[PDB]
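Help! Submission page says 'invalid entity' but I think these are all valid:
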Amino acid sequence: MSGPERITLAMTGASGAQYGLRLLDCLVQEEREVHFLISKAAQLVMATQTDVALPAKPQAMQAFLTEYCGAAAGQIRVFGQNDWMAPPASGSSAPNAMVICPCSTGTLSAVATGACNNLIERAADVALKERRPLVLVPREAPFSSIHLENMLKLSNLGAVILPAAPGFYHQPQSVEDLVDFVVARILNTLGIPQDMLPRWGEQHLVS
Amino acid sequence: MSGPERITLAMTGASGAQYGLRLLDCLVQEEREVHFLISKAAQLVMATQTDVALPAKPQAMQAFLTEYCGAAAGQIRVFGQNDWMAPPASGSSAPNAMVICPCSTGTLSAVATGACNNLIERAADVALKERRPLVLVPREAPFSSIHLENMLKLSNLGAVILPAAPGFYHQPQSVEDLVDFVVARILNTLGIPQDMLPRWGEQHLVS
Amino acid sequence: MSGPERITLAMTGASGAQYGLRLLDCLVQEEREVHFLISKAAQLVMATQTDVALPAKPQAMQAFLTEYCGAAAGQIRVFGQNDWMAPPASGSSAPNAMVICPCSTGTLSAVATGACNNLIERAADVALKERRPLVLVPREAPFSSIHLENMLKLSNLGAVILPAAPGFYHQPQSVEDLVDFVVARILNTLGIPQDMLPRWGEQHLVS
Amino acid sequence: MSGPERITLAMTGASGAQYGLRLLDCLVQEEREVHFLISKAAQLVMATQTDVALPAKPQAMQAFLTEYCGAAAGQIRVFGQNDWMAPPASGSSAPNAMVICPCSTGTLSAVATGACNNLIERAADVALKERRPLVLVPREAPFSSIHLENMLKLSNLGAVILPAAPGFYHQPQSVEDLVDFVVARILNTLGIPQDMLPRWGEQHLVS
Amino acid sequence: MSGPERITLAMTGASGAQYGLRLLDCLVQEEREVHFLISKAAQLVMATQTDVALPAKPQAMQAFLTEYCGAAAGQIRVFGQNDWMAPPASGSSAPNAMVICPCSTGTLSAVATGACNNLIERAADVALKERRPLVLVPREAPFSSIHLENMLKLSNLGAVILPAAPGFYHQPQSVEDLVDFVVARILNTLGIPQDMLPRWGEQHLVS
Amino acid sequence: MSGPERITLAMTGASGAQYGLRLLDCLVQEEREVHFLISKAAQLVMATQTDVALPAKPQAMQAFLTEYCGAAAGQIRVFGQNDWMAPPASGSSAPNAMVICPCSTGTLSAVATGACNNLIERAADVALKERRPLVLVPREAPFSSIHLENMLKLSNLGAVILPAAPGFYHQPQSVEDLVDFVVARILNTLGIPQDMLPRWGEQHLVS
Amino acid sequence: MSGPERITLAMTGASGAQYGLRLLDCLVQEEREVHFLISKAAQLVMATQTDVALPAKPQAMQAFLTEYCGAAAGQIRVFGQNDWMAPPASGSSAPNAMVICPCSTGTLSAVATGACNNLIERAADVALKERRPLVLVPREAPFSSIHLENMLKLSNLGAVILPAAPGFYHQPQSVEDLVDFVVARILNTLGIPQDMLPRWGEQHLVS
Amino acid sequence: MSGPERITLAMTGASGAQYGLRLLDCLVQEEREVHFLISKAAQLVMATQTDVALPAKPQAMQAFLTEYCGAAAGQIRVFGQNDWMAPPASGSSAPNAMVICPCSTGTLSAVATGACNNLIERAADVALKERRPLVLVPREAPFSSIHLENMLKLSNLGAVILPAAPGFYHQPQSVEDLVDFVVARILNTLGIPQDMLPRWGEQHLVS
Ligand SMILES: CC(C)=CCN1c2cc(C)c(C)cc2N(C[C@H](O)[C@H](O)[C@H](O)COP(=O)(O)O)c2[nH]c(=O)[nH]c(=O)c21
Ligand SMILES: CC(C)=CCN1c2cc(C)c(C)cc2N(C[C@H](O)[C@H](O)[C@H](O)COP(=O)(O)O)c2[nH]c(=O)[nH]c(=O)c21
Ligand SMILES: CC(C)=CCN1c2cc(C)c(C)cc2N(C[C@H](O)[C@H](O)[C@H](O)COP(=O)(O)O)c2[nH]c(=O)[nH]c(=O)c21
Ligand SMILES: CC(C)=CCN1c2cc(C)c(C)cc2N(C[C@H](O)[C@H](O)[C@H](O)COP(=O)(O)O)c2[nH]c(=O)[nH]c(=O)c21
Ligand SMILES: CC(C)=CCN1c2cc(C)c(C)cc2N(C[C@H](O)[C@H](O)[C@H](O)COP(=O)(O)O)c2[nH]c(=O)[nH]c(=O)c21
Ligand SMILES: CC(C)=CCN1c2cc(C)c(C)cc2N(C[C@H](O)[C@H](O)[C@H](O)COP(=O)(O)O)c2[nH]c(=O)[nH]c(=O)c21
Ligand SMILES: CC(C)=CCN1c2cc(C)c(C)cc2N(C[C@H](O)[C@H](O)[C@H](O)COP(=O)(O)O)c2[nH]c(=O)[nH]c(=O)c21
Ligand SMILES: CC(C)=CCN1c2cc(C)c(C)cc2N(C[C@H](O)[C@H](O)[C@H](O)COP(=O)(O)O)c2[nH]c(=O)[nH]c(=O)c21
Ligand SMILES: [K+]
Ligand SMILES: [K+]
Ligand SMILES: [K+]
Ligand SMILES: [K+]
Ligand SMILES: [K+]
Ligand SMILES: [K+]
Ligand SMILES: [K+]
Ligand SMILES: [K+]
C-alpha cells in the first residue's frame, strides 16, 4: 500500500467539519487505521453546521463513527483530549501521519508555539519532533499576520499548510465536489490513492 | 455611502474566477465605480472553468461586463495590462480601494517584491505607497513557505490577506452560497454593505 | 457621534480593575453599546481589590452592571468565556473597537501568539484579522523581555499598547483622578469624547 | 472639510525650504490651522537659499508668516524648540496631522530612534504613539543605508516617507511647478484638496 | 546592609516627579549615599506638577534636598548635566546602582542607542558596560513601537524596565499610596529594605 | 582621466527622463564611452514628458543620440532589451560603471531580487557580482516600505541609491538648474569631472 | 602621492587625545591638507590629560596648531561644531578621508544612528553616503553590547573600526611608541606612508 | 575577601603578553588561586615580545611562574592544552572566574562558536554554561565585522569584552602605567581590590 498505514486525524474548532468527516470516510475506504481526536469546540461546530449527531464520550463516538463510515472493527480508534495513554502522546509510538482537519487558529498557534495543552497539540508536537508527516488545514479569512507567522514557522520546519481553499478546475457542481477537492489534495499530500481529482495533464504529451 | 466609491478589481490566474465575477456583480449593485483589470492567465482560467465568454480586447470586454452585470454607462472601466495612462498607475489618481480576486501566487510574489511587471502589479505597488486599501484573495493549496512569507510581508505592511476559504456557518447549500460567503467577507473588509452573510451574534444579548 | 458605536470591553486578571469599571461607566455615559467579557482571574481581582460585588453568571452580571452604570436596557451585553455564539467570536460580526482593560501578561501573551483559549483571546484575534481597533492596557512592573516582545509584536501590527501608567500633569488629588487620567487616554485613543483630561496647550498660541 | 483641521508643520535643516513655505501657504488657503515649528538649522537654510527674511523669535515669526500667507488671526501658531507647553508635546492634545517638510537626515534619525531632543522630535514621537498621521519629506542624495534603515523602520510603523523627488508628468515649466508637484503629493497624502496636480487618468474610460 | 551603598538617581522629563522624590526620601532613610542628577526638562516638570521649589544650581540644589529629606551631610551629592568630573562618568568609579526615575522616552532612547548627550545618559552607558544595576522607570501612554523596541533592547541586555504602573492589591487610599507602591517595587528590584508593600503570601502555608 | 572610461547608462520607466538625457550629454562631453539601454516603459515616458522624438529601433536610436549629443562615431552604443550579445550581459566584459537613471520601482525591485528579466536587469546583476559601480536614481513619492527595503538591500551590498531629489543650495533658477544638480551628484559619485555644482566650502578656511 | 590629499580629522571626548595630536602631526609631515574638528568634551580631555593648551575659538586654534605642527599656511583648517558652511557638511565637497580619533562612545552612537547633532556627526554621515573613507578610533573598556552593535553596523557598511589597542610586536619602550603604533595603523588604513611601524615579515622569504 | 577566590587565567596569541603577566602578578598579590593556561601561539608571543623565558612544559612553567610572582606553594596551577583532567574542563568544578588575557581573534571565534578545540576554549564554554564570570581581553586593530559579531554575541550572553585599550586619564608616564590601567580595569570587572587606578570622582561632592 502506498502512503501511511495509520493516520492521526484531529478535528478542531474551525468552520469546516465537512472536510474532516469526508477525509475520515476516504481514509476508512482506503483501509487505513485512524486515530481520531476532536476538540470541545469542534464538537460545537459539528453540532451546529452539520447533520451529524456525534456522541460526546469516546467509546460511543467510536461506535458511531465506525457505523457512519462502514469501518472494520478497531479500524477507528477514538481518544479523548487528556488521554496521555494513547499512542500520539509519545514518540515511542508506532509511526503515524497526522492531519489536523480543520485546524483552528488556536490549534495552529499551539502547534507553532509548542503549547501541548491537550492531546491534539501534544500529538502534533510529537509529529514534529519525530519528523513524521504533519498536515494542517486552516479555515479562516482574513488570515492575520499572527496566523501567517505561525503557518510560516511550521511550514519552514516541514509541516504542510493546506488551506481549505478548494479550486474550480475540475467543474465542481456541488458543495460536496468542493469538499472533495480539498480532501483529494490532503490525500495526495499523504501519498494515499484517490480518484476524486484527476492527475492534471496526465494525457497531455505536447504543446 | 459607506465604503469606497471606486474599487480597482484585478483578476489574476488562480482557479477561482467565480469569486471575481460575483464580486464585480455585487460591486455594480452597490453603485460603485469599478476599474477592472485582468491578466492573460486569468482569461484562460475564465475560459476553461466558467461559462462566461469574455471578449479579449478592453473595449469589447467593457461592453460585455456592463451587460453581464446590468451596470450603468461608464460604471465599469476596463484597462489593459500595459495601459499606463489608466488611473491605477499613479498615486496622483483619485483614491480607490484595490482587490485582487483571485490573486495567483505569481501576482502575490510580484506585489510582495515590487516587480511592477504589468498594470495590476503596479496598481498594487501604488495602493501600498499611498496607504490605500489592498485586499488579496489567494487560492492555492498547499501554501508553501514562499507563499506564506510573501503574504506575511504584505500583511505586516497593512494589506489584507483574505484566502478563498469559505466557512460553513451559514448553512451553505450550493457552490454559489460558498462563493457568496467569500465575497461577503471581501465586502465587509472594504466596508461596503452586503446582505449575503448575517452579522454573527447580532441577536444574542447574553449567556 | 465620534468614535465607535460598539466597544468590546474585556477585563482580565491584572491588578487594576478600577480602570475597567471606570471605563465601562464612561462608555455607558457616552451612549455606547458595550459587549462586556471578564476572565475568571479578573473576577478574583475585582472581589479582592474593589468594593464591587459582581455576580458570577452572565445574566446576573448583566443586570448588576446595568444598574451600577445607569445603563439603558440592552446597552451592556455580557458574554461568558466559551460563548462562541457571541458577536466577538467571528469577523462577520458588526464592527466593534476592542479594549482589554486591564490586560494581564497572560492575556497579552495569548493575543500575541494567537492562542484563542477563550472568548476574550479569540475576540482579540478577530479584531486583529479584521483591522479593527484593539487597545491593551497592561498593569505589571517590571515588564520582562517576554512582556515587551509580546507588546512590540502587537504594536507593530497596529494594536495600541496603553500601559496603566497615569501622568501627573493635570494636578491629581485622588486615586480616582489617576484612574480617570488612564481612562481619558483610552477614550482619546478610541476617538470617544471625554472631559476628564483637557486638551494640552489648546489655549497656548505662541512662545 | 476633507482631511485634518490642524496640521503641525515642522521645517528642519534640509535644502528645500521652498517646499515647507509653499505647503504652509496652501494649508492657509485651505483654511486649516497650522502649528508651525522650525529648527535652528532650518533658519539658516531659509536665510541662505530663499528671499524670505524670517524673524528669529516665535512671536515676530508668527506675525511675519501670517502676513506672508494672508492667514487669519490665530490661524498660524508658532512654537519654539523647547516649548513643552505647546500642544504637540503631549498626546492629550487635540488630534493634528504632522508633516516634517523638509526633513533633514538628523531629524529623520531622531524620529526613528525616539530621541525627542526638541519639540519637533517629541511632536513626531507623539504622532507615532497616538497613531496620528506623520509625513516626512527628506531631501538628500545619495541616501545611505543609515538613512534608508531609518526610513524603513518608520514606514513600517505607518509614517509616510515622501521624498522631495518631483515628477515630470504634468509638463513642468518652472522651479515653482516642481515645488508644487511635491506639495500636491503631500496634500494628497493628508487628504486635503488641491488643484495643482490633476487626478491621473480621471478622464480615461478604456484601452 | 542589603543592597547597594550608593545609588545614582537620575530624574528626567516624564510626568512623575513624585516617584523620584519619594524614592530619594526612602533612599535617604535607608542610609544610602545618593548621587543625584536631574535634567532640564525634569526641572520643568517638578516646577509645574509639584509643590517642590527646587533651586536651579547644583550646590543650592544639594542643600535644598539635604534639608527636604533630612539627609546627613554629604549623603546626597548633586552633579550637573556636563560634569564629567563626577563619578558616574567613568567605569573606574566606585560601584553604584543606577535608577532613572522617571525615565522620559527621550532618555530611554538615548540609553538604548548609546547617545551619551549628558551625564545622565553617559552614567547609564557606564552602568551597562560595567554590568552594574540599571533600572528605568518610564511614564508614558501609549507606548509606541519605538518605545517598546528601546525597552526590549535594554531589557535583553539586563536593564530593568519598571513602568510607573502601580497595582491596587494593597488597598490604596491615596495618591501617595500609589506612588509608594512603585517606589517599593524599585527598592525591591535594588535589594533595599522597604516596608511600604508587604511580601505577598508570606503568611499563606497551603491551599 | 578621472573616473570610468565606459558607463552603461540605462533609462527605465520613471518620470524623470530629463535626468538620463542630461547625464548622457554630460558623459559625451567628458569623452566617455556610453553603452545606452532603454526600457519599453522609458520610451513612453520620453515620448510623453519630453520633446525628444527618440526612434524605436537600436540602430536609428544610436544615430539619433549621436546627433543629439554631438558624440563621436562609436562613442554611444545602443543595445536592445534582449541583446545578450552585448557587453553588459557578462562579467567577462570590459569594466564599466553602471547608472540606472531614472530607475523605476520595478527595475529597483528586479535588481534587488536578481530577476534578470531583460538586459538592464542582467547588466545590474553583473555589476553587482563583479563589484563594479552601480548607481540607481529612483523617482517616486511616497517611497513605500517595499521600495525602501529594496533600496536598503542594494545599498548594503554597495550600490549607490541616489534619489532624484535636487537641493536648493546653488540658487536654482530653472528646471534645468534642478536637473543639473542631480546630474552633477551622479557624476561626483562616479568620480567624473563636472562644473555644474561647485565644491561646497572649498573657499572657507576657518570659523 | 599615495593616499588622500585631504583628511577630515575629528577629535571627540574619549581619553586618548594623544593619538589625535600625533596623527595630526604625521599628516602635516606628509604634506596633507587637514580639516580639523574638535568637540566640547574633547577640549576638556585635551586640557586635563595633555600639556597642550589649545585655544577655544577656531581661528586661534588654527594658528596654534599650525605652529604646533610646523604646518604650511592654510594646510590646517579648523571648523567649529555648527559651521555648516564648511566642506564636510555636504557631499558636494571635494573628496576627503575622515578619521575620528579618538571616537567617544557618544560620537560612535551618533554616527551609527545618523544623529547629525554637530559638524563632526554630519561630516561622518556624509562620508558614509558618499562612500568616502571613514575610520573610527574608539577608546573605551569594557565595550558594552550597545557599543559593539554600533561598531558592527558601521563596519558592515564599510567604516573601519580601529580601536586604540596598540600591539607590542615592535619592542615599545615608551608611551610615545604605543601612541605611534596606533597612529601607524591609521595611516596604513588610509594608504598614507609611514615609517614608525615596519612592514611585518617583509624580509622573510621562506619557512 | 571581595571577588573570586580562584581565577582561570588563559593567555592566547595576541600581541599583549604584558597584560597577562601583570594580571597574574596582581592576582598572586591579592592571594588568589590561579589556574594558568597558555596557548602555543601565546608562548611564541611571550618569547618574542617579552624578556620572560617561560619554560615549555607545565610543571617547569608552574615552578617558573611561582618564582616570578612570589607565589605560595600550590597558589598557581598550570594545565596543558589537552588536560581534560583539570578543573576547567567540567562545570562540576569548583566556581572560578575566567579571564582570557590577551584573547586572540582565533580564541574569540572559538568561544563565540563553541569550538572547544583545547582546554582554554572548553574552559570558556564551561564558564558560559555555568553562568560564571568570563572576561575577554582582545588586542587587534582594526576589528573586522567578524571580530565584532563574535564579541557582540558573547557580550549579549553576559561575557565582558574588555579591549586592551588603555585610557590616559591617570597621567600615564610609562608603558607599565598603560599596562596597569588595563589590568586595573580587569580587576575592577572581577570585583578584586586594586590600587593602581583611583576611583574616579570619589572626592568630588558637587558641581
Ligand atoms: C464563531 C464563528 C461563526 C466562526 C468561526 N469558526 C468557529 C465556529 C464555531 C461554531 C465555533 C464554536 C468556533 C469557531 N472558531 C473559533 C475557535 O473554535 C476557537 O478559537 C477555539 O478556542 C478553538 O479551540 P480548538 O483549537 O478547537 O481546541 C473558529 N476558529 C477558526 O480558526 N476558524 C473558524 O472558521 C472558526
Ligand atoms: C494549472 C491548474 C489546473 C491549477 C492552478 N490554477 C491555475 C489554473 C489555470 C487554468 C491556469 C492557466 C493557471 C493556474 N495557476 C498558475 C498561474 O496562472 C500562473 O503561475 C501565472 O503565471 C499567473 O500569472 P498572473 O498572476 O495571472 O499574471 C494557478 N495559480 C495559482 O496561484 N492558483 C491556482 O489555483 C492556479
Ligand atoms: C498576585 C498579585 C498580588 C498581583 C498580580 N496581579 C494579580 C492579582 C490577583 C489578585 C490575581 C488573582 C492575579 C494577578 N495576576 C496574575 C494573573 O491573573 C494570571 O497570570 C492569570 O492566569 C491571568 O489570566 P487571565 O488573563 O485573566 O485569563 C496579575 N497579572 C498581571 O499581569 N498583572 C497583575 O497586576 C496581576
Ligand atoms: C551643507 C549643504 C550645502 C547641504 C546640505 N543641506 C544643508 C544645507 C544647509 C544650508 C545647512 C545649514 C544644513 C544642511 N544639512 C545638514 C543639517 O541641517 C544638519 O545635519 C542639522 O544638524 C540638522 O538639524 P535639524 O534636523 O534641522 O535640527 C542638510 N541635511 C540634509 O538632510 N539635507 C540637506 O539638503 C542638507
Ligand atoms: C507635555 C506633557 C503635558 C506631558 C508629557 N510629559 C512631559 C511633561 C512636561 C511638563 C514636560 C516639560 C515634558 C514632558 N515630556 C517630554 C520630555 O520631557 C522631552 O521629550 C524631553 O526632551 C526629555 O528630555 P530629558 O530626557 O528629560 O533630558 C514627557 N516625556 C515622557 O516620556 N513622558 C511624559 O510623561 C512627559
Ligand atoms: C503613471 C504616472 C503618471 C507616473 C509614474 N511614472 C510613470 C510614468 C509613465 C508615463 C509611465 C509609462 C510609467 C510610470 N511608472 C511606472 C513604470 O514605468 C512601470 O511600473 C514599469 O513596468 C516599469 O518598467 P521598466 O522598469 O521601465 O522596465 C513610474 N514608475 C516609477 O517608479 N516612477 C514614476 O515616476 C513612474
Ligand atoms: C570620565 C573619565 C575619567 C573617562 C572617560 N573618558 C572621558 C574623559 C573625560 C576627561 C571626559 C570629559 C569625558 C570622557 N568620556 C565621555 C564623553 O566625553 C561623553 O560621553 C561625551 O558626551 C562625548 O561627546 P563628544 O562625542 O565628544 O561630542 C569618555 N568617553 C569615551 O567614549 N571614552 C573615554 O575614554 C571617555
Ligand atoms: C603576527 C603579528 C606581528 C601580530 C599579530 N599578533 C600575533 C603576534 C604573534 C607574535 C603571533 C605568533 C601571532 C599573532 N596573532 C595571531 C594568532 O596568534 C593566531 O591567529 C593563532 O592561531 C591564535 O591561536 P591561539 O588563540 O593563541 O590558540 C595575533 N592575533 C591577534 O588576535 N592579535 C595580535 O595582536 C596577534
Ligand atoms: K479541549
Ligand atoms: K499579463
Ligand atoms: K477563563
Ligand atoms: K534646535
Ligand atoms: K540637559
Ligand atoms: K522591456
Ligand atoms: K559639541
Ligand atoms: K594549542
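Support: the input was valid. A stray whitespace character was the problem, and the output above is from the cleaned input. The two ends of chain D are 35 Å apart (CA to CA).
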